[PDB]
Amino acid sequence: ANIVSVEFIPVNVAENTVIVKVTDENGVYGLGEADGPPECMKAFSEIENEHKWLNNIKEAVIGRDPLEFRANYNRMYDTTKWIGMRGLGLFAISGIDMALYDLAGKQLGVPAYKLMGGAQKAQLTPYFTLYPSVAADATLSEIVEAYKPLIAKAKERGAKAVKVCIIPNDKVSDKEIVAYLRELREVIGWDMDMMVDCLYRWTDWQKARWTFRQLEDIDLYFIEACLQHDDLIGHQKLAAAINTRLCGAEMSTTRFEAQEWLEKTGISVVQSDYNRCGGVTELLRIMDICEHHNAQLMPHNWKTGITAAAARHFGIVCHISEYVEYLHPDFWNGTLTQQLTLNEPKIIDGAIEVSDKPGLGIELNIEFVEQVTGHKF
Amino acid sequence: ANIVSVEFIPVNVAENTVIVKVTDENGVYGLGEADGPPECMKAFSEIENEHKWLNNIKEAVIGRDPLEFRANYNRMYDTTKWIGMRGLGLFAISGIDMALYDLAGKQLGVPAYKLMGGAQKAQLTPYFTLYPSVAADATLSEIVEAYKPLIAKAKERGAKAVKVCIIPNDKVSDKEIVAYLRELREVIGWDMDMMVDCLYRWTDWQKARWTFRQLEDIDLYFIEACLQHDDLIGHQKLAAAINTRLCGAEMSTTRFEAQEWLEKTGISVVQSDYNRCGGVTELLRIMDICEHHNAQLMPHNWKTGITAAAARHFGIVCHISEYVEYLHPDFWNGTLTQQLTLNEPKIIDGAIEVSDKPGLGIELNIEFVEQVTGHKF
Amino acid sequence: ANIVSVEFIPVNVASENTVIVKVTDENGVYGLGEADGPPECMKAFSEIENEHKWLNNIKEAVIGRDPLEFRANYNRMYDTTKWIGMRGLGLFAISGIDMALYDLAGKQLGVPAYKLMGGAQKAQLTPYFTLYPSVAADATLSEIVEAYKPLIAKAKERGAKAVKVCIIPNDKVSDKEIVAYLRELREVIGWDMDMMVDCLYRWTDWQKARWTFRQLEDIDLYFIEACLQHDDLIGHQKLAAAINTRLCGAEMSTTRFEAQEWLEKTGISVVQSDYNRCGGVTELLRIMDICEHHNAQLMPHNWKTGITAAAARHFGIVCHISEYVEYLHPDFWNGTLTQQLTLNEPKIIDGAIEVSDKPGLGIELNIEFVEQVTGHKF
Amino acid sequence: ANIVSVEFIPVNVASENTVIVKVTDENGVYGLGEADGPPECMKAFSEIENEHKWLNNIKEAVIGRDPLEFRANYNRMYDTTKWIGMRGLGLFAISGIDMALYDLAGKQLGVPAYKLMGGAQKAQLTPYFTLYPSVAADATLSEIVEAYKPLIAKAKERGAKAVKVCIIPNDKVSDKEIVAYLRELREVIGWDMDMMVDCLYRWTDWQKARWTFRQLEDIDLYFIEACLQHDDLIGHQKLAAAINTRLCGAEMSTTRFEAQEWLEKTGISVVQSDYNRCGGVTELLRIMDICEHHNAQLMPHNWKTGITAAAARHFGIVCHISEYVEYLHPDFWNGTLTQQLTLNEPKIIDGAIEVSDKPGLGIELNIEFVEQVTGHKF
Ligand SMILES: [Mg+2]
Ligand SMILES: [Mg+2]
Ligand SMILES: [Mg+2]
Secondary structure, rough: OOEEEEEEEEEEOOOOEEEEEEEEOOOEEEEEEOOOHHHHHHHHHHOOEOOOOOOHHHHHHOOOOOOOOHHHHHHHHHHOOOOOOOOOHHHHHHHHHHHHHHHHHHHHEEEEEHOOOOOOOOOOOOOEEOOOOOOOOOOOOHHHHHHHHHHHHHHHHOOEEEEOOOOOOOOOOOHHHHHHHHHHHHHHHHOOOEEEEOOOOOHHHHHHHHHHHOOHHHHOEEEEEEOOOHHHHHHHHHHHHOOOOOOEEEOOOHHHHHHHHHHHHHHHOOOOOOOOOOOHHHHHHHHHHHHOOEEEOOOEEEEEEEEHHHHHHHHHHOOOOOEEEEEOHOOOHHHHHHHHHHHOOOEEOEEOOOOOOOOOOOOOOOHHHHHHHHOOO | OOEEEEEEEEEEEEEEEEEEEEEEOOOEEEEEEEOOOOHHHHHHHHHOOOOOOOOOHHHOOOOOOOOOOHHHHHHHEEEEEEOOOOHHHHHHHHHHHHHHHHHHHHOOOOOHHHOOOOOOOOOOOOOEOOOOOOOOOOHHHHHHHHHHHHHHHHOOOOOOEEEEEEOOOOOOOHHHHHHHHHHHHHHHOOOOOOEOOOOOOOOOOOHHHHHHHOEEEEEOOOOEEOOOOHHHHHHHHHHHHOOEEEEEEHHHHHHHHHHHHHHHHOEEEEEEOOOOOOOHHHHHHHHEEEEHOEEEOOOOOOOOHHHHHHHHHHHHOOOOOOEEEOOOOOOOOOHHHHOOEEOOOOOOOOOOOOOOEEEEEOOOHHHHHHHHHOOOO | OEEEEEEEEHHHHHHEEEEEEEEOOOOOOOOEEEEEHHHHHHHHHHHHOEEEEEEEEEEHOOOOOOOOHHHHHHHHHHOOOOOOOOOOOHHHHHHHHHHHHHHHHHHHHHHHHHHHHHOOOOOOOOOOEOOOOOOOOOOOOOHHHHHHHHHHHHHOOOOOOEEEHHHHHHOOOOHHHHHHHHHHHHHHHHOOOOEEEEEEOOOHHHHHHHHHHHHHHOOOEEEOOOOOOOOOOOHHHHHHHOOOOEEEEOOOOOOOHHHHHHHHOOOOEEEEEOOOOOOOOHHHHHHHHHHHOOOOOOOOOOOOOOHHHHHHHHHHOOOOOOOOOOEEEOOOOOOOHHHHEEOOOEEEOOOEEEOOOOOEOOEOOOHHHHHHHHHOOO | OOOOEEEEEEEEEEOOEEEEEEEEOOOEEEEEEEOOOHHHHHHHHHHOOOOOOOOOHHHHHHHOOOOOOOHHHHHHHHHOOOOOOOEHHHHHHHHHHHHHHHHHHHHOOEHHHHHHHOOOOOOOOOOOEEEOOOOOOOOOOOHHHHHHHHHHHHHHOOOOEEEEEEEOOOOOHHHHHHHHHHHHHHHHOOOOOOEEEEEOOOOOHHHHHHHOOOOOOOHHHOEEEOOOOOOOOOHHHHHHHOOOEEEEEEOOOHHHHHHHHHHHHHHHOEEEEOOOOOOOOOHHHHHHHHHHHHHHHEEEOOOOOHHHHHHHHHHHOOOOOOOEEOOOOOOOOOOOOHHEHHHOOOOOOEEEEEOOOEEOOOOOOOOOHHHHEEEEOO
């Protein structure tokens, strides 16, 4: 069955995503999501054709067989080059590409990981991103108290690894950041890996160098979003100077950017996002490039149960990576995280099951969607 | 006076553009234009704030002094990193940045070129892009026949240089393209510089190499858009193999990409667009990098009279460049080209005057604008 | 209104000297800057006769021009003086005029100069304050420490975030004694301020420098300045790669071409191209962009007059890549020009210095002091 | 005997000027040099007051010293003036003095300066002769060629092996017209003399130069000089790799540090650092060694006075890596200083010029002329 329609469905809650729904001639549909401001992303998908490199993105897949992942990706990418190629246009390709793996999977009656090359590990072991709910201008001390229940729950579930964050705070010194992360290591203990997301705190690599030299003894597994995203040279200098993994490419799009990060900086973990960088088809190309560089691919993953299902299948395929980033409802109370999808797999001993349900295995809360979009489904 | 509003105005002729209009406290306003699908760019400019790196672009400049180009550019760029940084999001920055030069110029009563560093050549001598009006499926000979009147008109105006194109056409062999371009040299003669826009015909650099080897005797000034935009390695091998200027970066955004092209390919002409790449503030930064590499900067210029005014002011500052690209109403009958702006400078002996009217010296055709938008300006 | 005259005004107090550069437009509004160099010789430089295409009097590149046009005017000064300029002392003269054109254009338009430099990009200006003590030759290191104490105390009192101390050149003293000297100063300074060190070109062998600053890792220097000879790019690159903090360079250089070579070849983390030497504010802006790409900081060397202090305040507030810039403040130095040439110097308040929206550079010149030392009316 | 005084003597004729540097020893024996730059300014530079460690009066590094000690004396001059020297105009001043010391030391010991430069390493000095036509501004390319004819005929009559011709700076004329002009000049020169071209910094875009010199491949230029802007090292390297002859550079540079950066980055095949700019003979000799490593030639810019001509004769006989050196000969130029400042200039004989073994530089100064134009007694 060939593709008949593509729909970008904004989901705004008073917290937002764009559901990408791709339907075939039999009425079977695949789901995915695209990053970006939802009404803007919808307008992007409904533009009128202009010339050879500026076409409505949908027209590159209407009438096509969703199995043909490379052909469809290249077609979307080529016909929209003038408004795409990098950035927001790639978000929209990502969403459709994700929905194509779900659709083709449901058409064939096979789980998406099979269409991604096949399971290459016995188990999926994520690292769990812990972000605490606190007030603006909450102090470092209050943030640590808020982290306690989250960290306690990760232990209770047997998590192998957790990431904590530095909430952006320019009223606080790097020496106070050092004490803050030393404290968090104490609370986490030494039976889980500890990653830090710096959330772009630093601009001077030598100031980051000072900090993470102080912290060598808390044995960080990786340091993420340390310096500004454009500053490749600062990254390469920092990575050569520290004694663990530096991450990068969180906000990037395409294998081309991923590859430049790898070539230029020596980051050991690449974070190109499922719903930003061009999607699963492009992530698979980035995996093969990561492998040559002996780098891990842990795609940024902080959206909805739709992306979580894409991470489950890609995760069981991505043999080069010990962990992938995971947003689990046990640790986050966002309305979409709790309500958009149903029957989210439980964390058992630090692992989550990847079911062999056809496609991405997504159980959408259709009634919740119809409720909030006000439009029927 | 501080900026009070920013409006993105779709102009769509039933040919399109987005007019960006930025108004200060005294009701004085500046005009720029942004590339991209017009309704989609509007939606972009009207998004809601979500977080540190995802804010409504307008909010980075409302309440700010438009004189402060670097600060305003940086704030726009920084507060929109999550959806900008490259691609569509940078178009929206460009339009505003363009407007800001127009506005800051009217506020102070000085032409924009003075705020861009000051005039550094006696005269602006552009190269004129000539695209023929022909039926799709036109033969190469019919295209040449449509070129003859255009080229004769350019000679009549004293044009120092012209660019001709290869209309995308996969039913025609490279051997036929060679004959086609030889015939165009005969028609142009040996008193004007001849540039060629390949419109991304080639994928294999060796096939391009064959073509431009046969053509060494027609003495092309540059070859533009010869290979696929992502293929830096193909460009670098081609530029080293040929005996003139290779261009690139026509579709690229930011100085980071322009600099990557220069470093890796050794292209001799950078073509970052006024209304795509970040705008005039970024182009000035690209200009400095080009100077280091002894490359020329000839920004892609194919929109409206609004961008034309930008090219005039930028052209007169850009001392590293013998020419800049220019779409002149003498050579193109597109509606926006003919009607959106009033009192376009005439081509006199190959030159176009840059006036010292305040700002960009844009005379908007407001009647026309109200006629097509359905709303009062 | 166009520029009508340029004047280089030597100022020598009977060593305390500068060259004041005054650029005056058609309405009699003027802009002030200052040039580095031997004052009477800089004056002769500005008064030379024309000779050929790349050897012209420097004033003639700007007389009759709009001071708003920074790039065009800079480029015209640089090109028409290439034969005697390009690098070095010729560049001091361009720096002085460039500085004054920011002050003049700002005065013409009624705006502070930082607006003409792109606009403010930090909430506050937080310099590091250079502390040089007043002592005899053959002051032992112990006496230099004593002399430092009241200076370091005053910076603490003003809430300084950072201070730089110096190794007065002394070849009767071992590196072992230098290590103790610096350990002492860190003790006196405390751990609530960043500590920078100016080596004043003590070392020639990078391996000897390497030994010294390996011992000093525990005092946590923020940067190490003027460590090796200024020409020795290879020694700097080897030292930078060996140590564990920032190495500085380019203090004596002129032009973005030299700055960029330093960056490429050595990996210095802090570039010290001087306001009144390297080409001026227009050239420092180009250098800033180049530093940005290399993730280096730009902290222009600043040890002249309150005329340069003003340029540092405005450039400081625009230079977002740099956490600090070098600052000479009257609280810490008792030189006659520092104390008397300008009035009403902004006070240090919680380590910060106010950059006002006073037009141009916001310079308050002591007219009667200048008139008295020069001997001619202003 | 030790040096007792150093004097910088402006010679400004009513562009026709130079600065004569005269260094006198305890017995009243003197050496002569000259320094580039505006004469009254170079005098002020030489007469400045000491200020600090890297800022001293240049004369004070050599007064009381033995003139035989070229490296020590150069290094001293260079180190004690770094703050205002290092690159550019300050290096001119060093150059003039360095030159004078070769003359003085040679007169002291009764040897020709070439011996103090390591000894003669070629049988003959065969210069290339720079031919510059006396024409009006507004001269057409045709009128320029017509003024070139009697010059070029003169060179042939002298048996010259090589001449350089120039592109007078002319933005009204196209490269296609420059191509015709240079082809016409090769017809006039013929095929028995090497032909060099001075582009006088016409080009800014290397790809435009590339176009021009590709057309001219069949006139077989020996070298192409000053083709692109002096700072633009990357355009030079690209142009050097594209053409099929020698590209020159570094005409305006100072020090071995720049000459070495040109050679490393660009692959120029001829270095042109100037006797009276770059540092002098002592620095030229160091540049010679770096040229040898790179298999580049060293042909120092030589368009000054007979004083520099004598240095070029002495250096030229030592500089075995170079087939030719640049020479301004009075047969080909009517400049007042060229004709009058010095006496008994060596004649051109079958394209060669004698290097005498008169002591030092073998300069015969026209004292009367010099006393006439300075007003002072010599
Ligand atoms: Mg094009
Ligand atoms: Mg210092
Ligand atoms: Mg020359």
